Subunit: 144 residues, 4 copies
Amino acid sequence: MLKSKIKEEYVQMDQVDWKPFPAAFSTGGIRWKLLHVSPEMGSWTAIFDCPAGSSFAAHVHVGPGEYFLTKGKMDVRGGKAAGGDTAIAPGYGYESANARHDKTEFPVASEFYMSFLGPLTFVKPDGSPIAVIGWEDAQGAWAA
Amino acid sequence: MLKSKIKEEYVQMDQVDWKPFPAAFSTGGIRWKLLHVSPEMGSWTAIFDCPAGSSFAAHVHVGPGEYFLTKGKMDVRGGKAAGGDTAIAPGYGYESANARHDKTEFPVASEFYMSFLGPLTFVKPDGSPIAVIGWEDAQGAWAA
Amino acid sequence: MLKSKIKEEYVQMDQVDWKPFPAAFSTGGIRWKLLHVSPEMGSWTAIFDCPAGSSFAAHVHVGPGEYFLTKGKMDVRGGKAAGGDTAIAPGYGYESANARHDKTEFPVASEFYMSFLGPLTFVKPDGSPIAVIGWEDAQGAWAA
Amino acid sequence: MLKSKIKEEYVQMDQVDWKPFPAAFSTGGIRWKLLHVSPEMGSWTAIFDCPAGSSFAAHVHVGPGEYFLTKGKMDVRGGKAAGGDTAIAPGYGYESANARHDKTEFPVASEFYMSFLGPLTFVKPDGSPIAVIGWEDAQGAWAA
Ligand SMILES: [Cl-]
Ligand SMILES: [Cl-]
Ligand SMILES: [Zn+2]
Ligand SMILES: [Zn+2]
Ligand SMILES: [Zn+2]
Ligand SMILES: [Zn+2]
Ligand SMILES: [Zn+2]
Ligand SMILES: [Zn+2]
């Protein structure tokens, strides 16, 4: 079977409503827009609106992810003081495969765009997996 | 101060002994040779020696995998009779991101080479994750 | 040889100066910041500052690319009127492998962040390759 | 309206005839079987039947490639004597992004399986691009 090329996509982001990000995987009122999923590679891209005081549940990146913090301030891997990074808008980060994000948090109301290659493994304190959340999970939470 | 290109690799495969593949994730005394891991993308490549009756524990591919069955016969996604496939050497298979392999098994003594983008999530019958096994887990099981 | 995991990275983007984007591949005064290169996969990520009236030379994406237009307006694949897209900030686009970008242009002063998997093939009107420009080329133009 | 998972594939390789590999990019009467193309990422996978003395035209890998030499002997990056490698079956090789293969050649009748992420840029001796040959080019050469 001859395969065709993949269609290009365009999203007018201000004509897409924010949705609450699942409470199972965050606290403090985080909202999101899913922008794209790639079913073949398993990559996906989203933007997040994160109130001051908000955070994501503990997780591990199984593939590389890259972010552009456009507004605010984000502590990753503990924040700069703890030997991680404190992203301050405008900030770019490369979170490598295997990166462990125990409590990514937002000291200031923030907005960040992130692309992910593959899923996030949400983990218990002992590192055991709770949920493996990737493109398909994202698409369903966004659109189903 | 600038990043370098990644080094090329070569493995003389017949000068590498088969090692036992982890019992936690397989049955039947499967052996393997780990050939490559890619830390950045999280891909990994190995060849497997699979006795008749052997199998891998239930798992989900979080990214694409590609196999070359060089000897024997493998039932994947339940075998062709079940709407899956039954690979017979020489066979090639593309296992797409999110492919669910509840019991990939070998009715005949077999050998196959396979590359994996990202981890395999080994799952309980309800789909709960047991372990997410990726490049560094493969390396770790091979090394020592 | 045991391989280690890839280091995470952080770039404070407002402490990095804009550089002129090569005249060989653009017109109208485009500036850029290279944010990241991935030597293994060949991916790279940059942000661009594009004056009104500016454009990039004709090119083909050999892999997928994704952009976030944070300011302004960008005509891609001819613009919406011509059957491409007119990105209007805030806009997201997925430019698939093989996408042909004859004259990506900026009717309004714009800023966009883009990630690229693999190089761009800059082409002559007849489609013949002039230059294949990827992570390594980007890193050298940025940093050497 | 939501994107579907990519379909799995299977090829019974012995029920596919060898076809001639393009003369534009090789010497010696190499034959091949194209096994898979991935439109989204731009990867592709094939097996090659290479007569003694055969070779591929000078090229650069824009992304990683991985080969399994199942029969014979291949000199890559000039052969091991030149600081390259000389693969002897059974051999595995990782050819990293940006690997320059001026004359990959076969001193003995050989066969190898290889997966490619992205295109090969075939080059003139000065490094100028002649042709960028990727998944869709492979498909096109195979199909008809
Ligand atoms: Cl998923
Ligand atoms: Cl490059
Ligand atoms: Zn994270
Ligand atoms: Zn499997
Ligand atoms: Zn792991
Ligand atoms: Zn473009
Ligand atoms: Zn090559
Ligand atoms: Zn092409």
